[PDB]
Write a protein that binds this ligand. Structure first.
Ligand SMILES: *[C@@H]1O[C@H](CO)[C@@H](O)[C@H](O)[C@H]1NC(C)=O
Ligand SMILES: Cc1cc(C(=O)O)c(C)n1CC1CC1
Length: 360
């Protein structure tokens, strides 16, 4: 319990229910690296689904019940044993309380029951951190898992530009998107988009952006143009437009991807049709990562990675994620490094064909 809660001093930057948003902080004064981690936790795209999320997932919509401290785990750990990558860095955990994939900039009003301000939350956290040491940082790594991973892709360049416009050109802004690299593919079996689970990837974001007034990166916006900004929530479409360095971590068989595709791998037989579907999904994911030079994509069926305590255990081609991220750091001090790889994408075609996949 090393990270201390700070509620945002600008109380107009709010969680869904209007309570102040905020962040958890552990300073490391002998370090110029800052890690800002964006929590995940799905989203809600209408008043009905958000009302239900407020009833039984309230911490994802309100700061009123947040604990005063948080323990940093995984890449947020300060223990070298647990975090061989960035154990000495300044650590920031930003709770997800906007249900908007970190894309909203809409104040709650007489007209709107809920505020969706995820993008403004990130900007306001960054602004208040400047006075707490971030002003002297050498690297600001914006990281996130699941909806937070998509949040990284939607916000990393805005953070970069915010810091330039504020007068801090020296801070190198980078992104680490964990489990937020999704495919807008066809479902294995069609379900009507009623809720977050039974909703096709494409339909979910289309309703979402409208409901949150979601904003997306400018260059991507300008490619897909008006009405079609939902495209920018899918990594393989928004990533090529990003200016900042972004490392992508993505299971080939992400449980949340399989959920929105209406696939449930129990322990019972999988018939030819499901086998084909699952193998094609892994192949398409690989294809989208071919031109992402810094990436870690193991052939596993799993949910999320980088803040779990044993994130160090998985390897692709003999390299762990902490090592790959270290190599990525070195690559940014183009031409590949001897024995320090950064592009690590499994090629085998079925869940757990990588023996180091998390086991449960
Ligand atoms: C506080 O946040 C609100 C909400 O976006 C914004 O309109 C205002 O400019 C902010 N004030 C300061 C001083 O940053
Ligand atoms: C943007 C996002 C966050 C999550 C999540 O599980 O947090 C998922 C699945 N997406 C993709 C959306 C099309 C369905």
């Amino acid at each position: 319990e090393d990270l201390r809660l700070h509620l945002l001093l600008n109380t107009s930057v709010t969680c869904n229910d209007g309570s102040p948003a905020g962040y958890y902080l552990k300073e490391s004064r002998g370090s110029r690296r800052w890690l800002l981690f964006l929590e995940g936790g799905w989203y809600c795209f209408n008043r009905e689904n958000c009302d239900s999320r407020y009833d039984t997932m309230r911490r994802l919509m309100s700061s009123r019940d947040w604990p005063r401290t948080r323990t940093g785990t995984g890449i947020l750990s300060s223990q070298p044993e647990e975090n061989p990558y960035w154990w000495n860095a300044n650590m920031v955990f930003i709770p997800y309380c906007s249900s908007d994939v970190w894309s909203g900039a809409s104040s709650k009003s007489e007209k709107n029951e809920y505020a969706f301000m995820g993008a403004l939350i990130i900007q306001e956290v960054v602004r208040e951190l400047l006075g707490r040491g971030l002003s002297g940082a050498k690297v600001l790594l914006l990281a996130g898992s699941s909806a937070g991973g998509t949040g990284v892709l939607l916000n990393v360049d805005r953070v970069a530009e915010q810091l330039e416009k504020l007068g801090y050109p020296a801070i190198q802004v980078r992104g680490l998107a964990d489990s937020g690299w999704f495919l807008d593919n066809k479902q294995y079996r069609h379900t009507d988009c009623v809720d977050t689970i039974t909703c096709a990837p494409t339909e979910a974001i289309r309703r979402g952006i409208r409901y949150w007034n979601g904003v997306v990166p400018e260059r991507c916006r300008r490619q897909f143009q008006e009405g079609e900004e939902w495209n920018c929530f899918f990594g393989y479409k928004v990533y090529p437009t990003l200016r900042s360095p972004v490392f992508v971590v993505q299971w080939l068989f992400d449980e949340a991807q399989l959920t929105v595709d209406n696939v449930h791998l129990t322990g019972q037989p999988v018939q030819e049709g499901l086998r084909l579907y699952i193998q094609n999904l892994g192949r398409e994911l690989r294809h989208t990562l071919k031109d992402v030079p810094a990436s870690f994509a193991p052939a596993c069926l799993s949910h999320e990675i980088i803040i779990r305590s044993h994130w160090t255990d998985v390897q692709v081609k003999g390299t762990s994620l902490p090592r790959a991220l270290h190599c990525w750091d070195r690559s940014l001090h183009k031409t590949p490094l001897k024995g320090c790889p950064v592009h690590l994408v499994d090629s085998c075609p079925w869940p757990h064909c990588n023996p180091s996949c998390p086991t449960g």
